[PDB]
Structure 1
Amino acid sequence: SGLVKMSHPSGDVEACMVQVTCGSMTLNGLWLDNTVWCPRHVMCPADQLSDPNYDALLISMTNHSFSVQKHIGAPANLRVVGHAMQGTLLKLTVDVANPSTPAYTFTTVKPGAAFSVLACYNGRPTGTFTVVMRPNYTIKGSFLCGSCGSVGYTKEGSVINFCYMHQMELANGTHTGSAFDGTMYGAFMDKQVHQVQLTDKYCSVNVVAWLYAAILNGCAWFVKPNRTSVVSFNEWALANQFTEFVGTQSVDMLAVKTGVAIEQLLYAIQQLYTGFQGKQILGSTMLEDEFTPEDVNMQIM
């Protein structure tokens, strides 16, 4: 069917991973120029992790409280000379700028958008994969203990956009983290207390993209003349666990290429949601919302 889960080559980001340690707590960090980023629950002792006091934990610290090492590529003479708190992240200043710092930005990711994740353990990259920010502001990653501070990113021209630093696993196999302004996706708390997510929805625009990808690979039995307006679809969606459909130029390109209108697919989504009646789309019997329109454009062209 042509659609694999593709990630950005991780070499750029691999060169920026470090191990942050704070006493005997240790996790992963991002070394960009003279700054190391890592989640702030590294100051916390396991005992006090159930209801900690980060401002208290912070004034407790000085530069000497933190140690940063680099285990990958050229070794790791790193002296912390500054430290600040920023939302749920620590902002350490180190005395050596990273020579491997890529061109980069900090931007928050919206639901339905896809990014690449570099899973790291003790400052060592181990695996990469790709996730879609869910409507309930979680991601379904593969994160084992020691993975906090793993980094999520997308790439533009030469510009890496860092968008996600791992922090937590909720009661399902479900993860959340921070943007690089310190805020947490979905407003979860970096405290080991029971926290429930909101119910998830389908990303409508991605389901439309996948449907276009089927029409592009000669699977179009679900296409009829009938149409549902966008405004009509978004009303129906509020009551059916579906996100507002918001069009883009990527979607529009697929509409022109296949010659099938958005409104035709919004209608089909409404019929396929009640069940495929035992037929198959691209090898599947359920709606798929993990491929963005940009992905279909890249892979199917």
Structure 2
Amino acid sequence: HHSGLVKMSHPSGDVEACMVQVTCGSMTLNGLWLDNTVWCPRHVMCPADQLSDPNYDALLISMTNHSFSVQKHIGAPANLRVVGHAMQGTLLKLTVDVANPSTPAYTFTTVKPGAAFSVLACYNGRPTGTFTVVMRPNYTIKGSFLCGSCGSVGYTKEGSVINFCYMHQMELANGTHTGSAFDGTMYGAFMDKQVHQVQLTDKYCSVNVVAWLYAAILNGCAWFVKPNRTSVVSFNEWALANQFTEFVGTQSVDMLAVKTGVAIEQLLYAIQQLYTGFQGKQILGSTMLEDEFTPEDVNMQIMGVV
């Protein structure tokens, strides 16, 4: 029995029309062209022999508008003339002569651990794929990025408005990925320099495990449900000792509780037991807890609620 759950991304067309190639000498990556501004990672300015410890302030001052080449390849080809440049945190803000005529309605937002967003993976300014990820508790994502993907963008969508939340910067030693918000801050404690960096311990996202257990119930799979209950306060003390995020309920989780008639606290109890072992049983085809689906995913994909 298939749960009806897939890794669902937003349609990517609105964002595809904003992607450009940014080159600064022998360095090339992707940028995001909104209005008269092109956002890209600041290490486009860095030569390779300096990626391990750039002085980005001195690199910035050494740039001229002439130093940057911006090109659009897909759909409406163009060379964009750079007329201003500035640095915000780990991003460059280039000002260009032409406003993107396909600029969608948009905002900049930061994404929180456990929340999902869509990524448009791009190489040389050309969109090549799209996928969805959850921000992990250690501020990494389990993405799929290769050399040249920096500047690829992550976003969510509220109606027609695109909320840009991620610009790709780096790959960590364990194969996960991280980047910047559009305020220029890196997620987590990471720095945009090519040095091994301590990364924090990941955790299970409790709210997303609860969501998945509700998805299972919505599919007729409820062997793990008991009248036994664990309170949120007690579960959260357990979580701290057992590599779980503390649980914080939301209206989306409450809708699942109402639809199924199973209380959150019954699933917090179940999580405690299932963490010790599934005892040879499966939940939605899995022998391990799943935390890559959000309450909103379950409401939308199974219940048709947005």
TM-score, length-scaled by structure 1:
0.99
- How far, CA to CA, are the matches of 1:50 and 1:200 in structure 2? 25
Shift of 1:187: 2.1
Residues 3-62 of structure 1: CA distance to partner in whole angstroms, max 9, x if unpaired? 000000000000000000111210000000100000000000001111110000000011
The 10-residue stretch of structure 1 (192-201 or 13-22) with the greater mean CA deviation from structure 2: 192-201
- How far, CA to CA, are the matches of 1:127 and 1:29 in structure 2? 16
Shift of 1:254: 0.4
Shift of 1:173: 1.2
Shift of 1:123: 0.1
- How far, CA to CA, are the matches of 2:10 and 2:266 in structure 1? 33
Tell me if 1:280 matches 2:282.
yes
Aligned partner (choices 244, 247, 266) of residue 246 of structure 2: 244
- How far, CA to CA, are the matches of 1:110 and 1:118 in structure 2? 19
Root-mean-square deviation (CA, aligned residues, Å) is 0.5
Are the equivalent residues in 2 in contact too, given 1:16–1:30 (CA < 8 A)?
yes
Residues 98-146 of structure 1: CA distance to partner in whole angstroms, max 9, x if unpaired? 0000000000000000000000000000000000000000001010101
- How far, CA to CA, are the matches of 1:294 and 1:77 in structure 2? 40
- How far, CA to CA, are the matches of 2:202 and 2:76 in structure 1? 43
Shift of 1:174: 0.6
- How far, CA to CA, are the matches of 1:187 and 1:63 in structure 2? 31
- How far, CA to CA, are the matches of 2:105 and 2:53 in structure 1? 38
- How far, CA to CA, are the matches of 1:203 and 1:290 in structure 2? 8
Shift of 1:77: 3.0
SS across alignment from 2:155: strand
Q: 1:140 — aligned with what?
A: 142
Shift of 1:172: 1.4
Residues 182-202 of structure 1: CA distance to partner in whole angstroms, max 9, x if unpaired? 000012111111112111000
Shift of 1:75: 1.3
Shift of 1:257: 0.4
- How far, CA to CA, are the matches of 2:101 and 2:87 in structure 1? 25
Residues 137-163 of structure 1: CA distance to partner in whole angstroms, max 9, x if unpaired? 000101010100000001101100000
The 10-residue stretch of structure 1 (174-183 or 186-195) with the greater mean CA deviation from structure 2: 186-195
Q: How does 1:225-244 map to 2 (within 5 A)?
A: 225-244=227-246
Shift of 1:168: 0.2
- How far, CA to CA, are the matches of 1:49 and 1:280 in structure 2? 47
Aligned partner (choices 54, 57, 72) of residue 55 of structure 1: 57
Which segments of 5 or more consecutive residues in structure 1 lack a partner in the other structure?
none
- How far, CA to CA, are the matches of 1:251 and 1:268 in structure 2? 16
Aligned partner (choices 1, 15, 36) of residue 13 of structure 1: 15
Residues 194-227 of structure 1: CA distance to partner in whole angstroms, max 9, x if unpaired? 1121110000000000000000000000000000
Shift of 1:296: 0.1
- How far, CA to CA, are the matches of 2:238 and 2:77 in structure 1? 57
Are the equivalent residues in 2 in contact too, given 1:103–1:160 (CA < 8 A)?
yes
SS across alignment from 1:185: coil
- How far, CA to CA, are the matches of 2:230 and 2:203 in structure 1? 19
Aligned residues: 301
- How far, CA to CA, are the matches of 1:14 and 1:286 in structure 2? 36
- How far, CA to CA, are the matches of 2:19 and 2:165 in structure 1? 15
SS across alignment from 2:276: coil
The 10-residue stretch of structure 1 (246-255 or 68-77) with the greater mean CA deviation from structure 2: 68-77
Are the equivalent residues in 2 in contact too, given 1:170–1:196 (CA < 8 A)?
no
Which segments of 5 or more consecutive residues in structure 2 lack a partner in the other structure?
none
Following TM superposition, where does structure 1 have runs of at least 4 consecutive aligned residues deviating by more than 2 angstroms? Answer: none
Shift of 1:71: 0.5
- How far, CA to CA, are the matches of 2:43 and 2:80 in structure 1? 21
- How far, CA to CA, are the matches of 2:88 and 2:280 in structure 1? 51
Aligned partner (choices 129, 132, 140) of residue 131 of structure 2: 129
TM-score, length-scaled by structure 2:
0.98
- How far, CA to CA, are the matches of 1:41 and 1:187 in structure 2? 17
- How far, CA to CA, are the matches of 1:242 and 1:187 in structure 2? 20
SS across alignment from 1:263: helix
Identical amino acids, percent of aligned pairs: 100
Q: 2:199 — aligned with what?
A: 197
The 10-residue stretch of structure 1 (85-94 or 184-193) with the greater mean CA deviation from structure 2: 184-193
- How far, CA to CA, are the matches of 1:127 and 1:196 in structure 2? 29
Q: 1:78 — aligned with what?
A: 80
- How far, CA to CA, are the matches of 1:251 and 1:184 in structure 2? 29
Shift of 1:2: 0.5
